[PDB]
From a paper:
The lasso peptide MS-271 is a ribosomally synthesized and post-translationally modified peptide (RiPP) consisting of 21 amino acids with D-tryptophan at the C-terminus, and is derived from the precursor peptide MslA. MslH, encoded in the MS-271 biosynthetic gene cluster (msl), catalyzes the epimerization at the Cα center of the MslA C-terminal Trp21, leading to epi-MslA. Herein, based on X-ray crystallographic studies in association with MslA core peptide analogues, we show that MslH is a metallo-dependent peptide epimerase with a calcineurin-like fold. The crystal structure analysis, followed by site-directed mutagenesis, docking simulation, and ICP-MS studies demonstrate that MslH employs acid/base chemistry to facilitate the reversible epimerization of the C-terminal Trp21 of MslA, by utilizing two pairs of His/Asp catalytic residues that are electrostatically tethered to a six-coordination motif with a Ca(II) ion via water molecules.
Numbering used by the authors:
A (entry chain A), B (entry chain A), C (entry chain A): 1 to 208, 211 to 439
The structure:
């Protein structure tokens, strides 16, 4: 009875206007987005009218701040529901995220992942349309510590921020390696410098055989290894809100931002896969991932899709018109630098970073078709971001032509093969997932 | 011709009123402070009327926020110049530090160490009195990353924050230990997870024989060791502002907040001693340190005093009326907790943390007498904070009685002995430094 | 692949509504402007809702302030990118230019040439359209000293203002004339009045054989002459921003406001020609000039056009409804004057100033067609401003009829002849530049 279509996309790092060019492929991408019931993208840029202060985010590539008019470029492109939890939503601080919320509400744009407190950032947003409703939840596993939102106490208010998916990594080492680490701790004098913390806490905070040194936790194992696990608090809370959202919407979509790689850059972290499985277990109809500037595999779990990374639907980092002083300080210069020259020198004039490689300039828009919560179709539309084009022209999305779409679909199928995912391929280069239903 | 007296003190963590009790010793402390030309303390608490949001500062003991009325308790006690750079000035964020600046300016209280940008936080404050002027500069080596203030760029404004004294620690390890660390990096799979960062940067960011892993830098040495060094940028900038301040004031006082211990908790970090020597080299008349909840040694360098830690002149952490939710979460509870019960359970009802030990409840107020920039006197006044008293009564300062003052002066002399500092002792328990001039 | 069209125009001094009349020629001008990708004009009037205070600008013809509704008359006419640097943007002071920026941003009108500081006034504005992007930079060589914008210092903010192109003029005189000037300096007693400036500076500021007297710099030469040179700071900075803008846009257009005449009123100043050559050397695709109330020549330099003066696309000075007191004081009167009567007496009731002469009421709209940065077409559309019409009807633009367009095109060709520019002429009176590409 209820038939709904949802368009998904990755990170949207838009800093300029004219997002949809006069190219018929870009206009067809816009027609595809406008033709669905819900089009979801994840705003990875702070829309600003001036409120806030730049935070030091050199580990995230610098501050990504743009004129608020870019919001109109998003909605006019066809997107209607925004996920806002990522490692850049706090680039202008708490004042910046409050201003972003104000801007989004003034334009009637439903959003999730950020709030005035932790609860508001964890809540789903309900987008209602004549055909039905979609609940969007947004979280991020990549962010600077302290940027997560906080709930109030009886005496103090909360803190504006993002919806966090924290995780801990543990280094498994052999007993001999462990004892060598303890010997390094003792002989260097590092242990001595915990003496006060010994007498105040009563015991060494490094001994919990487990160990904690250099801001990293080690554990004795038969063979060396590396494991990651989700924060139980965040996992349980996000799952609780997913279970809540299923009661109030036809479709529940969980968006997660995660740069964390697995054993190889193409594979997600183990904690992320556990998290996506948990989200589908609690009743989510789809899990859309992003973070990396490239595509990752697609997995069908309990007849629901998991897109571990859809890459970037928009990529205009080097075109931002506002570079902070701490970002400028990353490049030694004999004279003051303009933003474009700064970004040119930052990549060695295109010889480093994401420009020289092709996998960083392809993306994918999945269009999912559900009938009463059952996934009946999952079309895949490859997107070209303009690899090799000038910096001012690359990063704008368009439906890839047949050849490039076939190459992108091959990449996606290869990345999805370890999960047992199969893809039917159309003559135009688009495709769709093989379903069991 | 110009004769000036300056009273120094450590961290002032005031959260309640009635700072100066009806005890004649406390009133005599107030008379001592009011009797000098300048009385300097370092405000380690956010005075608030409601502006800002609590930041996660569990590593600093939680948020320390107090009613702005406590400012009147400081000035009425005799203090007239405030240093504000410490690990708690940003407990309410950038909005909180802006509100603190507004409150201090509305009450006519000169302050330094915080500003709307990095320059404003680095500037000295000039306190003018009929007898002459004092320039105060305030910085801190202990703070959460990102809390330092930032200067504007051509496109973006700065960021409100504190005046930073950053520093880096290096672990010297033998070549065999170094190779074991590299083997741990490789065999655990940690190196594999840098693969992307390898292809984007062109080289491994862990190889700079030096090494960088687990957020810590290691270097091959003949014998294991541990070294600390000041950030060259911060050292040079603070020295430049000290040289600037000498041109515009009779006396220049540099206040530094530093929890960092040396080989033993009583000794300062090597970087801190280098910093104090540099400050006196650039023309500072005194360097007053704080951070630890206990006293550290006193050193005479080029006939100028360096108080590495004056402890706390006020210590009312457990009496704060505003505990954040993230601070409450540090204590498991079967029911919601009130602030006092939270602090009681936080210390195991007085069996842990700073309460059981005496060195945490003594302090020192030095009164320095300069004549045309030459240190002619340096009286030491021991301060009792009420060890063993109830939690609501301990932490308020008073001039210690003869016995306790003698014990405190003995402690200070023992802590100062490695620097060659000698102290003459009065019959009342007070004393003064032996000078060469 | 990339094909873009840009419409250019001169100064837009609009003070009334109904800018596009019901005349089919005016509607065809509007259709021409709306039909291009970018239509650039230079707003020479302060749009005001009441913010600011009139500055004394009697040397610029008085204050030119208009109701902000005139902005809607500009955009509805077809213009989409505004240059704002001219000798009238500061007619309401710094508050006035801030209000103008607010008004332009509220209406979504891209602008350049003014900012809250010097950098913001020097930045290009990027207008994005489905077919591509255009970068506009705006500066002015005519303005009251002090009206240029200023950048902040570590202690003080900047100053809102215009983007300046300063220049210095030097009078070459023979050695005998030079010595006569020095003798006039000495014998009149003018040199004596520099005595204090002699003892404070250490040397006479008039002796730098060069000389500086009467606010003018003289230099000994074999034959008397007159030279002008650009300010090196402004030239280098504007060129730097042009080089920056080329990296981020398909087309870069530099708009310059300059009243300064050369040896004859029809010829530009030497500094202006050097500046335009420099702009094209740095990568500008076109240089559009304005300032004089008449047309100047067109020059093709390195296959890029330089329009030294496009005159006025709108000229409604005498129709302004707000005349300042200092402007009223320019006309002696027996009774208080209304604005229209003031402007009538100011021109001797049409017998003086710009009204009696025809070259002041013709203009030109060039439509340039670029293909991947290469100029492929440059159509010229003569514009009639209504010479001889009543004052309330003249100044509104319309496409000139065949006869008047032929006369205007002849004028433009004659003014362009010294630069080697040739023009093909259509049957309707319009034309296009002869290109080498
Ligand atoms: Ca990201
Ligand atoms: Ca502290
Ligand atoms: Ca003018």
């Amino acid at each position: 009875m209820t038939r709904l279509t949802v368009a998904l996309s990755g990170a949207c790092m838009v800093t300029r206007g004219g997002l949809i060019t006069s190219d018929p492929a870009a206009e067809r991408l816009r027609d595809l987005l406008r033709g669905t019931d819900f089009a979801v993208t994840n705003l990875e840029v702070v829309p600003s009218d001036g409120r806030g202060h730049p935070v030091h985010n050199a580990v995230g590539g610098g501050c990504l701040i743009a004129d608020s008019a870019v919001l109109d470029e998003v909605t006019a492109a066809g997107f209607s529901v925004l996920g806002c939890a990522n490692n850049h939503a706090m680039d202008l601080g708490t004042e910046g995220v409050l201003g972003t919320m104000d801007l989004l509400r003034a334009r009637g744009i439903p959003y999730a992942g950020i709030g005035a407190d932790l609860t508001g950032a964890r809540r789903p947003v309900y987008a209602d349309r004549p055909g039905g409703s979609l609940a969007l939840l947004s979280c991020t596993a990549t962010f600077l510590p302290g940027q997560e939102a906080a709930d109030p106490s009886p005496e103090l208010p909360g803190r504006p921020g993002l919806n966090p998916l924290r995780h801990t990594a543990t280094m498994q080492v052999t007993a001999d390696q462990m004892d060598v680490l303890r010997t390094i701790d003792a002989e260097t004098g590092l242990r001595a410098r915990r003496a006060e913390a010994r007498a105040l806490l009563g015991v060494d905070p490094a001994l919990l055989d487990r160990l904690a040194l250099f801001g990293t936790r080690f554990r004795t194992a038969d063979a060396p290894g590396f494991t990651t696990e989700c924060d139980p608090r965040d996992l349980d809370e996000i799952a609780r809100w997913v279970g809540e959202a299923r009661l109030r919407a036809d479709l529940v979509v969980v968006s997660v931002h995660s740069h964390e790689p697995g054993p190889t850059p193409e594979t997600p972290g183990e904690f992320l896969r556990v998290f996506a499985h948990r989200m589908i277990d609690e009743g989510a109809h789809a899990v859309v991932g992003h973070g990396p500037h490239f595509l990752r595999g697609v997995e069908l779990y309990r007849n629901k899709p998991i897109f571990y990374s859809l890459g970037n639907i928009v990529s205009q980092i080097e075109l931002t018109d506002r570079v902070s002083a701490e970002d400028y300080a990353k490049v030694t210069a004999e004279r003051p630098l303009t933003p474009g020259r700064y970004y040119d020198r930052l990549s060695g004039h295109g010889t480093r970073l994401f420009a020289p490689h092709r996998r960083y300039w392809q993306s994918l828009v999945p269009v999912l078709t559900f009938e009463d919560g059952t996934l009946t179709a999952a079309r895949l539309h490859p997107v070209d971001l303009g690899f090799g084009r000038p910096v001012h022209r690359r990063g704008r999305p368009r439906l890839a032509d047949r050849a490039e779409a076939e190459k992108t679909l091959t990449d996606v199928a290869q990345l999805s093969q370890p999960y047992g995912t199969a893809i039917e391929v159309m003559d135009d280069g688009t495709g769709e997932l093989a379903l069991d239903v």
